[PDB]
Amino acid sequence: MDQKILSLAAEKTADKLQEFLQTLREGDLTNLLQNQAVKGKVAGALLRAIFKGSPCSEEAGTLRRRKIYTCCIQLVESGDLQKEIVSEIIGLLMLEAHHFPGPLLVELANEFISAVREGSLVNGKSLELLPIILTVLATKKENLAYLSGEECKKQLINTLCSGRWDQQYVIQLTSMFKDVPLTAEEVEFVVEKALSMFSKMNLQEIPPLVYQLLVLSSKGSRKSVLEGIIAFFSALDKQHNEEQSPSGELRHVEGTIILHIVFAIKLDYELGRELVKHLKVGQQGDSNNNLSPFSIALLLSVTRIQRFQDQVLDLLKTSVVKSFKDLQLLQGSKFLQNLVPHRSYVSTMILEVVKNSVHSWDHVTQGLVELGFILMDSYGPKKVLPSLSRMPNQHACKLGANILLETFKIHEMIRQEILEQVLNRVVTRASSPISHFLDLLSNIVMYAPLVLQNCSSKVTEAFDYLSFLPLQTVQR
């Protein structure tokens, strides 16, 4: 049955295939079913033969084109083919989907939407067709009425994003939308629907959905994606804290959302400014409830991009001094204790980050050390060589040391970098007060000198500087 079609297709166009098309009127479904049953190359040959034998100026061929589209769209998912014929089918449809009027492409898009609502998309490989069609609706300036084709695109997108999405087709539905030329409103609809769809998924199918969301961010909507993922993982961290009152699942998830945002900030140096703006505390004074052990881990991972490093540390530094001002106001007054329900402070969050960091987060830990030593180097004493100049500086400098001592206990590779950096401050300054480093160095030793016989040579190189120190420093 197919060989005569090839022989008619061999020589010339529009002289026998149109005339032959008004011979065989029905049964193109079963034709392609037996064709994919026998050989897919013959299916591509026949597809080209029909598409050249059915131009889109005349209207008899357009109906065969629609029917054969529905046939191939159904069998590409439901029909378990080999991969090469699948690629050939999708390429052929994607190519030939320009030559149409409006309403045929519109009802095709409606068929896609009506399928993805209810209709069991067995794989969802048909979806690759979908953005081409919407792209064609973008450029089809032949008028419709219900409109411009772009307005039909707006309506179809709104109908798609507003309607229910299946759990299995949120990655593919987002990856699809990378290739449609969208404005701000359409992409905000898409990210909003996708972020809404986070709670109804496996955790392990959130990282790749975030990846697509980040690449797709680059058009309009960066704030919405960052706000969305910080918010969602802040909520999960809090629910885990209340249940303690999945963890190597949850941590290996935030340990790949953080790398996705960091890599995306390297490729895109405006997602970083949006992340800093969105978590800066010092708006005027007030500490925001956007800071959490998620959203701080992510600031410590971004300090290893060299443009952000000072900017992100000065943020965390003020974020910690402000907290301690606030806490002193409450503890000094009952009137404020009655009203305000007990808030977690940045101190407790940072010390939670340090607990969380044990597993695999080494990206984050080299920025905890830098925050530690910024807090101690900046807020440590000088006034001996008042409340506000002393006690929220005394309390930062002891958070610093707590950060470095807790970081020093569990991260066995930032020992010879803390303990050579504490020493290099004890030896070399010796005019400025360095009690706070000696305290930290006593704490570090006293905790475990068993874990300092693996970082000992950094001590015995400071014994050679011992002659030139003042005496009180030597005794201490």
Next chain:
Amino acid sequence: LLQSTFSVHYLVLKDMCSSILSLAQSLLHSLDQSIISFGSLLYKYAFKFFDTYCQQEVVGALVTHICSGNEAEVDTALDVLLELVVLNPSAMMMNAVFVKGILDYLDNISPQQIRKLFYVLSTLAFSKQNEASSHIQDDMHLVIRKQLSSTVFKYKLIGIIGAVTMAGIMAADEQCTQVTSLLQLVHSCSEQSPQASALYYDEFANLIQHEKLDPKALEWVGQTICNDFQDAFVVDSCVVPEGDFPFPVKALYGLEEYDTQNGIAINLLPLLFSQDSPLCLAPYFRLLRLCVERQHNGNLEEIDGLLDCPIFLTDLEPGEKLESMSAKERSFMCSLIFLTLNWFREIVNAFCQETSPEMKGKVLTRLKHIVELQIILEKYLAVTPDYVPPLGNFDVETLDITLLLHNSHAFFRELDIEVFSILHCGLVTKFILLGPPELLFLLEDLSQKLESMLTFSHLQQRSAQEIVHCVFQLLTPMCNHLENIHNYFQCLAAENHKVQEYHIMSSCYQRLLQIFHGLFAWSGFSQPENQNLLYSALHVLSSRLKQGEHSQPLEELLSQSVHYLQNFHQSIPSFQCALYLIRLLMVILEKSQNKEKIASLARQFLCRVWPSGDKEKSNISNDQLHALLCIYLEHTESILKAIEEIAGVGVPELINSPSSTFPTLTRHTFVVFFRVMMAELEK
């Protein structure tokens, strides 16, 4: 130093990966390519010597270069990636995800880089040791298929280039099914734009000539290419075909050894009239040529008909009666002559290398046909400058796009280097007793190749060293005969004392010396590898007077060679060619007291007439005189006393001849003379 540093002390360095990479990254953001080269080397060694974490940080960083990027940094990072996939593809596959993810950021990238990118990605992809992560094939196929299936040509070219490049890498039967399906998809998406099909044909042809692969996809396509060509353009030699034409259609530009009442003739005018498929004639022939050269190993036994077959064209008489029609049919004619020229260029590009003397005669007739068409086409362009037949070369020039010098290099098909194998054969002279403009064509090409290469697609995939290496063979000991024949010609013309013969041979001379300058001003001679070639090259220049003095010291060969070349200074017709000769002598004699030869010779050129033809004295322009007089005034020992010589003869300029007792002295020339006088005074 950096190589030794890392290769010895990669235990001292290991613990400071991150700072090195902070440094590397800062020496790609610069200009000054020695810096960028250094940064590139940092990234390469960091990757090579350190452990698997620093590899990962390195790949990350290059990826970040590529995606965020600016052009040179992107190019350098792609070059590094090629070196890293060549060096250790095992450890680069574990960092394949970052590389795959570049496909999400292809808007920054330009299609010269895209060929490299898809080279990298496919070179990673088609190693059978990590088939389990075949994810990058799926993502490559997706982006190919999404680009290809787009009306916008800017995306379609990406698709085509990535597609044929993928095809080339997976060509070292399922793979062959993939290649054929992919290429048929490209064909299908290209057919319905002409320039897309053209780009397909061009890039596929380039893929063949650079990388030969297993000829299974090639024999697959070639049975379609030959059949499609032999029914698309090849017509039986019937004088008038069907169709309504307001033009006497004949079978023109046949070689006439051919029997008229025969087969093969090439349809142009019914094609382009039916359009208003022809635009691919040249690249399609290139493809045909290259595949049959790969099949039959340089034999064109079934394509010799293509060499001599007439062309179904209108009457290409100079259409002075076809004036006042500057309508679209004028564009039809201009484009027609254009298309057939590109056709012709591909033929002479194709059959130059063949050694059969009658075949060389056919080729030469083709060249004279080319130049006749060129002068006719320039006549037709002199009618209208506005009617562009916009058809660039499709690999590089057309995507750059999407008067005679622009179309001369940018529009026509590009000649190969082996086209200059023709002029092994010796010139014949028509007036005194291969024509003069059949020598001007080749040399006007070769000058533009050399200036672009040493200070244009198919050329630049050869290294400059190999270019000059074959020039040494394919110019000097072959064109020396033509040079000496030119000397003999101008000697006979000087002893005897139409005009266009001498005029062409003058420009031929000018271009020969400009080629010489470009060759002997080659900075690769500064490097200690290429002087053995000078011990070849100038030895042959020495051999044009006397042989027998083999294995000579350097300055002896120099002296003999300049002693050979100097004597042409009697036969120099114009100013610019003299300037090029003396500058040639300048730049060859710096390989060796010396100022005496140049200054005397500069004086010889300065006391020479350089005769007072109107366009000839127009060829004495301000900058040329300025440069020449700077050379003379610098190489004289008494510069200020020489200023007294010029001012001492600068006063009798007005008293003898308004053109002096020191020639090159008019009222107009005194601007240049004064400028150079006090310029060298300043220096």
